[PDB]
Amino acid sequence: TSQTVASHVPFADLCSTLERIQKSKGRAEKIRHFREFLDSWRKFHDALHKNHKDVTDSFYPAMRLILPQLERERMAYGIKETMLAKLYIELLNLPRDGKDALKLLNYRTGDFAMIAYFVLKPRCLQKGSLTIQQVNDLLDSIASNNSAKRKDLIKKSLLQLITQSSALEQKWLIRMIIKDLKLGVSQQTIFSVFHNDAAELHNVTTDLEKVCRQLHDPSVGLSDISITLFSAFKPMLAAIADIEHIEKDMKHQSFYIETKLDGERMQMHKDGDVYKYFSRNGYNYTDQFGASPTEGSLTPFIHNAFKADIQICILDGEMMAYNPNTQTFMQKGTKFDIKRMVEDSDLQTCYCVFDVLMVNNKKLGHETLRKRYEILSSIFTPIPGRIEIVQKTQAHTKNEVIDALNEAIDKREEGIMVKQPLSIYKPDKRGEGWLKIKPEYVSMDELDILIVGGYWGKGSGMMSHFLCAVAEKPPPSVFHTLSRVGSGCTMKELYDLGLKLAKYWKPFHRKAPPSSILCGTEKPEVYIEPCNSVIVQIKAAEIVPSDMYKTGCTLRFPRIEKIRDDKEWHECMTLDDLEQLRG
Amino acid sequence: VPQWEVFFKR
Numbered sequence: 001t002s003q004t005v006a007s008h009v010p011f012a013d014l015c016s017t018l019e020r021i022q023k024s025k026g027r028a029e030k031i032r033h034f035r036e037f038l039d040s041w042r043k044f045h046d047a048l049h050k051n052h053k054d055v056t057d058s059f060y061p062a063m064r065l066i067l068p069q070l071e072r073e074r075m076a077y078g079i080k081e082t083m084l085a086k087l088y089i090e091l092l093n094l095p096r097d098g099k100d101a102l103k104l105l106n107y108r109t110g111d112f113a114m115i116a117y118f119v120l121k122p123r124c125l126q127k128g129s130l131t132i133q134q135v136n137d138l139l140d141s142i143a144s145n146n147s148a149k150r151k152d153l154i155k156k157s158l159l160q161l162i163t164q165s166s167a168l169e170q171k172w173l174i175r176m177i178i179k180d181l182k183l184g185v186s187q188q189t190i191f192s193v194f195h196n197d198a199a200e201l202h203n204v205t206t207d208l209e210k211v212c213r214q215l216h217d218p219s220v221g222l223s224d225i226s227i228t229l230f231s232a233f234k235p236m237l238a239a240i241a242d243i244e245h246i247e248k249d250m251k252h253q254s255f256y257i258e259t260k261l262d263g264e265r266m267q268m269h270k271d272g273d274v275y276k277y278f279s280r281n282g283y284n285y286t287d288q289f290g291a292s293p294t295e296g297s298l299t300p301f302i303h304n305a306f307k308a309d310i311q312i313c314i315l316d317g318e319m320m321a322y323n324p325n326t327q328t329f330m331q332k333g334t335k336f337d338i339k340r341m342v343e344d345s346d347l348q349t350c351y352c353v354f355d356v357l358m359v360n361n362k363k364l365g366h367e368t369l370r371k372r373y374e375i376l377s378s379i380f381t382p383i384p385g386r387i388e389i390v391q392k393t394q395a396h397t398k399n400e401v402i403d404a405l406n407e408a409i410d411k412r413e414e415g416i417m418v419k420q421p422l423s424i425y426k427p428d429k430r431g432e433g434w435l436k437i438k439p440e441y442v443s444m445d446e447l448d449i450l451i452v453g454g455y456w457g458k459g460s461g462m463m464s465h466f467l468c469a470v471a472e473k474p475p476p477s478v479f480h481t482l483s484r485v486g487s488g489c490t491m492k493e494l495y496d497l498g499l500k501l502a503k504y505w506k507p508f509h510r511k512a513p514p515s516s517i518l519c520g521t522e523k524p525e526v527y528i529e530p531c532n533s534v535i536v537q538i539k540a541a542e543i544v545p546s547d548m549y550k551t552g553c554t555l556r557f558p559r560i561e562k563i564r565d566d567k568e569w570h571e572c573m574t575l576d577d578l579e580q581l582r583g
Numbered sequence: 584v585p586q587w588e589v590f591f592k593r
């Protein structure tokens with residue numbers, strides 16, 4: 001009658017197993033102790049359910065305490081080490097000014113659980129009373145009441161966990177709440193011991209419960225473990241690659257160079273008017289983006305972009321904040337508050353899709369990437385700034401990838417992606433088919449130089465690039481150009497700077513140039529008098545020889561990091577400085 | 584009804 005194994009196993013039996021494992025020296029011994037607990041569970045299960053029919057009961061109530069980091073059903077506990085300290089100080093009735101109280105309070109980073117254990121052990125002699133199931137009920141209570149900001153009920157659930165458990169169970173309970181058990185055995189090892197297929201399964205369903213239920217019998221595997229509709233799969237990952245080796249790395253055959261967006265990795269699951277969104281760690285973001293075309297920040301706007309033949313699909317991409325007025329994606333690192341601006345409709349959510357894993361009743365994971373891309377084009381018609389196919393192009397040249405990387409950094413992207421056209425989709429696997437390339441930046445990151453010129457181009461107009469200079473050391477009235485740098489308004493402060501500078505630009509005349517600003521072959525469309533301009537902080541990979549600038553050199557992969565409006569124009573970097581820097 | 588104590592501590 002709805003019976004469960006967890007309802008018969010003392011949490012104490014779980015914690016003694018954990019203790020034995022943690023205290024065990026070698027991998028083999030650690031594994032042994034786990035197999036022993038597991039096997040008892042499985043044999044008891046068979047006994048408990050021999051007569052029972054169609055049972056959903058499994059190792060899950062234990063599994064989730066053993067791998068607390070993978071809990072997805074329960075929301076956050078919201079319990080601080082310092083909050084426990086206080087509860088424990090009051091409850092154990094410690095001298096409020098004594099070493100024990102203070103050691104719990106002033107705890108920083110011996111985990112807290114151990115410090116707590118050594119205070120508890122002399123004082124808390126009770127034998128434990130709770131089943132694994134009851135521990136789960138109480139943890140559920142904490143999470144649920146956390147979500148509701150019902151602090152008092154939270155205390156009461158905790159007080160039932162503590163006063164009902166032994167000292168040793170509390171040490172483990174604390175680790176289960178912090179979600180760091182410190183067993184000295186990887187979660188990969190845990191899955192391997194549980195079932196040959198546990199890890200593969202977990203990668204395409206970020207769900208311990210399904211993993212435990214479906215693989216409850218060790219001696220029967222699953223085949224064609226695959227991405228399935230409404231199951232969070234772990235994203236495929238890009239490995240770092242040095243530019244020098246790329247041609248080899250892409251197997252000396254054609255490859256894709258795709259835009260690298262720094263957003264939130266999000267997967268979209270679609271069946272009709274029903275949508276689910278999962279983040280990279282397998283959390284549900286459907287409340288924000290929209291379950292149905294009538295709800296949320298995205299779904300109502302993209303629902304009708306899906307072509308007529310499309311009833312079911314699974315997409316992988318990045319959520320970006322798009323600025324409609326400048327047609328620009330906003331970078332994560334800004335002084336400004338992106339989520340609020342998206343909620344205030346100053347920015348909007350844009351889904352940039354680079355992959356598709358299922359279309360209708362058809363699984364795509366084991367298709368060539370090239371085939372997947374073809375299919376992607378058929379999935380939906382893009383709407384700029386809401387749902388888009390990430391831009392890609394074919395290439396086979398190390399040369400072509402530097403071009404890509406140069407233009408990427410120029411447009412204030414932070415790198416590029418390189419992908420094998422024949423590669424298949426491999427959940428949670430890093431590298432393999434996908435590489436990422438970024439500049440080799442050298443910590444040179446604090447180049448503070450003056451804006452002396454600008455270039456109009458794409459976007460609202462607003463400027464696409466700045467020309468920057470260093471100061472000639474005065475006995476500052478003369479500057480020497482050093483580099484063009486991308487100006488795109490990927491952060492509002494660059495946009496605000498533009499409005500600040502607007503009234504100061506002056507037409508640059510090659511045949512009658514200003515004296516305060518000395519140029520190489522690179523001339524700006526407009527310039528600005530130095531006393532009217534602003535220092536920007538520039539990150540660069542290196543300084544290289546160049547006749548385009550007066551300094552006789554320029555910056556490789558430059559990028560504005562900060563607007564240093566906290567420094568007067570005359571605080572500019574000098575040639576003398578730059579010379580010293582090159583060494 | 585199978586009892587847990589004999590499956591674990593055995």
Ligand SMILES: Nc1ncnc2c1ncn2[C@@H]1O[C@H](COP(=O)(O)OP(=O)(O)OP(=O)(O)O)[C@@H](O)[C@H]1O
Pocket residue numbers: 237238258259260261262263265318332354390414417434436
């Ligand atoms: N076009 C793309 N195709 C596949 N994956 C991508 C793409 N763009 C971004 N990603 C994933 O998103 C990540 C970017 O996240 P994030 O914003 O942290 O980047 P970052 O901090 O600028 O640098 P890094 O990429 O090294 O983390 C990439 O590392 C990659 O795993």
